[PDB]
Amino acid sequence: VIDAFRLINANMMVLGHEPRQTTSNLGHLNKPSIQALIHGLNRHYYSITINYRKNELEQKMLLNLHKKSWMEGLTLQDYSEHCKHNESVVKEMLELAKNYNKAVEEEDKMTQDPKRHLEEHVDVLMTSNIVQCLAAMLDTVVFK
């Protein structure tokens, strides 16, 4: 939340002139905030756009902040925790599957949340398992 401002001359809005001319469609792509309107975002001062200027080197140096090391790329997940996660997700998915059976039967008889939850849970299980399994094989080959 950064906003830039500049004033309006006392003989500008009282002499019958708009505060700031408009020759390009650029100055109307950002909407003002009621917080500033109340205090007069358009009675005593402007609001100039920001448009941050980023080189190509600063962006890389900042990417280094969370850049993950090759270690984190190639390191396995604690197998105990992984198995516990598999088990918990498969149980929750079983519950959602029972609810899904009930829902499909009910809807087909009388003429969703279970399906969507089941889809997200299948996604998480498959991504976790495939990632860890491939990391395991890669290590078994690379470190011997």
Place this chain on the structure above:
Amino acid sequence: FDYKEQLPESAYMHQLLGLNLLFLLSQNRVAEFHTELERLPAKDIQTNVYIKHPVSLEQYLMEGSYNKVFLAKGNIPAESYTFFIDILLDTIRDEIAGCIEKAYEKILFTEATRILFFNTPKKMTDYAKKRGWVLGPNNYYSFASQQTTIPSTELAKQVIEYARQLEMIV
């Protein structure tokens, strides 16, 4: 088999037909053998002798009664059935081999001679001078029985394949 309606029945036919069946058995072409048997009419399999004999030989050879196969040598409907009996003995020896090297542990010299109906004992060395199942250990007929590492690369291929078909848009 083709010009059946026009052609008159040729009593001098089953001889060559069964001799062909014998030839197929001789060159171990069991698939073609049974295809031609199917082509033949049903009754001839059980009535005629010229065809029954090759049928009998194949049936015995598939059962495994190689002793009956050998004993059938004297029983030949016509002397024309010759030189294919000999190629059939050779092929039978090859099949007996197949058995021996696929599923045994070790056969000594005397027992090899007893089982494989080799030529005279002096040439009994035959089929070891020819096939040579790495023979030699201890007794020359030790038969050298012709009977654990993660396949990481192949498993990686398959798992990457799962990922590929799961992430590709379709």
